[PDB]
């Protein structure tokens, strides 16, 4: 019926581990692409099918491997994801947006035979770290292809974006690289009403929670992607009637529900 489903009924349980599909990496050197930093892609092995696609971002002074975890559990879970380097450490978030973009048309166009052949290259994503996830907001506002954004911790200057593409924004409400107050929830309120919105804020978490496995942030990331980029209703269940004591605080216009 859904052409795009992958994978088991999904549990809260199996969305806070690695997912029922095999991993395969691929190491885009830096010389071998423009706009880009290169990076590494993760992709389901063992398998025919075809899955949408993730680039994701790092945030200011790190690497892809900041977060290698989350484009494995990703993957795991039946996504092609494209963690980027950008070409600088030091690139800002309208930079790491270009950057995107920049890897979104790789995936689609460049990328091995190995990749493409796990890829549906009509259904693509991105998500980011801090000033990447600020890169995410600005991509958002210029490709309403998109399926779904998923900004981590997210840091910009630039608070007010127009996307119709949803969003769900993860805080941490010890943040003090990108404080809550001043990136994150002005991120989400300054969204349009008619968008498909969700702002999560984790308890306790520090600006680099993101950088390690975690489970509240396994969970919303994979179901927000799996919601819009398989329109996966499933995982309806983990974004609707929340009862989460891993958060502090909960903000949405309950668009994604129904
Ligand atoms: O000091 C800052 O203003 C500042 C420092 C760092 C970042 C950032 O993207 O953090 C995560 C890096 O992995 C953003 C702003
Ligand atoms: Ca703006």
């Known amino acids: 019926s859904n052409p795009y489903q992958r994978g088991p009924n999904p549990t809260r349980s199996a969305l806070t581990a690695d997912g029922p599909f095999s991993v395969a990496t691929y190491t885009v050197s830096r010389l071998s692409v423009s706009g880009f930093g290169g990076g590494v892609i993760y992709y389901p092995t063992g398998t025919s099918l075809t899955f949408g696609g993730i680039a994701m971002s790092p945030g200011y002074t790190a690497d892809a491997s900041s977060l290698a975890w989350l484009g494995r559990r990703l993957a795991s879970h039946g996504f092609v994801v494209l963690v980027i380097n950008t070409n600088s450490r030091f690139d800002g978030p309208d930079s790491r947006a270009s950057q995107l973009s920049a890897a979104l048309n790789y995936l689609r166009t460049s990328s091995p035979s190995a990749v493409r052949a796990r890829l549906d290259a009509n259904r693509l994503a991105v998500a980011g770290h801090a000033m990447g996830g600020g ?40 943040d003090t690289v990108a404080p809550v107050s001043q990136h994150a929830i002005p ?4 969204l349009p009403s008619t968008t498909p919105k969700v702002y999560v804020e984790l308890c306790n978490a520090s600006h680099i929670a993101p950088n390690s496995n975690n489970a509240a942030i396994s969970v919303y990331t994979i179901s927000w992607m799996k919601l819009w980029v398989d329109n996966d209703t499933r995982y309806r269940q983990f974004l609707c009637n929340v009862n989460d004591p891993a958060l502090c605080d909960f903000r949405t216009n ?3 529900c129904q």
């Open 187 to 190: 991120f989400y309120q300054n």
């Open 135 to 174: 890169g995410t907001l600005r991509i958002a506002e210029q490709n309403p292809s998109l399926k779904a954004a998923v900004p981590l911790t997210p840091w910009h200057t630039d608070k007010t974006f127009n996307t119709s593409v949803p969003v769900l924004i993860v805080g941490a409400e010890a």
């Open 254 to 256: 309950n668009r994604h």
